[PDB]
Design a protein around this ligand. Structure first.
Ligand SMILES: Cc1cc2nc3c(=O)[nH]c(=O)nc-3n(C[C@H](O)[C@H](O)[C@H](O)COP(=O)(O)O)c2cc1C
Length: 169
């Protein structure tokens, strides 16, 4: 596929979201699903369009598989690549660290020469702080199954539609 989606998950939510995103894009012929846990950093080189999925754990911390591969990221060719992000978080229980993981990954990967695409509005959420917010918008799709599970489907639908234009589909 032209789009490589790499996700990490602890309790499975981010994987379900990744599968739904793949489905919304048109399936396996359009998006390849890859669990970062089973990947080498070089695996990301095979795609020119990437989607990075990661839930926030601990207190504003990276999901462990992403945490473990983080230091290998700078060896990857992200030069000029369009990268989109999504994450699972809990805005009620972690209002000061909502979606921090996605923010941490985007800060790192964008500093490696990539172009972030897929910005998302913060208005549909209620939180205090997030490392995933740059000038009043999320750097990617924020999903919250803990507090807003009923909004997930339409958010993915809307975001993928937005991404298609931003990627070139
Ligand atoms: C112990 C614990 C810590 C968490 N820490 C955060 C956090 O700092 N920020 C946040 O947005 N969500 C936080 N969450 C919420 C998770 O990101 C959320 O439950 C998500 O659905 C987990 O996704 P996963 O199943 O892909 O691992 C935490 C949840 C638990 C149970």
């Amino acid at each position: 596929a032209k789009i490589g989606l790499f996700y990490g998950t602890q309790t499975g939510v981010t994987q379900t979201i990744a599968e739904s995103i793949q489905q919304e894009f048109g399936g396996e012929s359009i998006v390849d699903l890859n669990d970062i846990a089973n990947a080498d950093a070089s695996d990301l080189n095979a795609y020119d369009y990437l989607i990075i999925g990661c839930p926030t754990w601990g207190v504003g911390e990276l999901q462990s598989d992403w945490e473990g591969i983080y230091d290998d990221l700078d060896s990857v060719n992200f030069q000029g690549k369009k990268v989109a992000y999504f994450g699972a978080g809990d805005q009620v229980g972690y209002s000061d660290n909502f979606q921090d993981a996605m923010g941490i990954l985007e800060e790192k990967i964008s500093s490696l020469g990539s172009q972030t695409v897929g910005y998302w509005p913060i208005e549909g959420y209620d939180f205090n702080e997030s490392k995933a917010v740059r000038n009043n918008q999320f750097v990617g799709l924020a999903i919250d199954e803990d507090n807003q599970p009923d909004l997930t489907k339409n958010r993915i639908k809307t975001w993928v539609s937005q991404l298609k234009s931003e990627f070139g589909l």
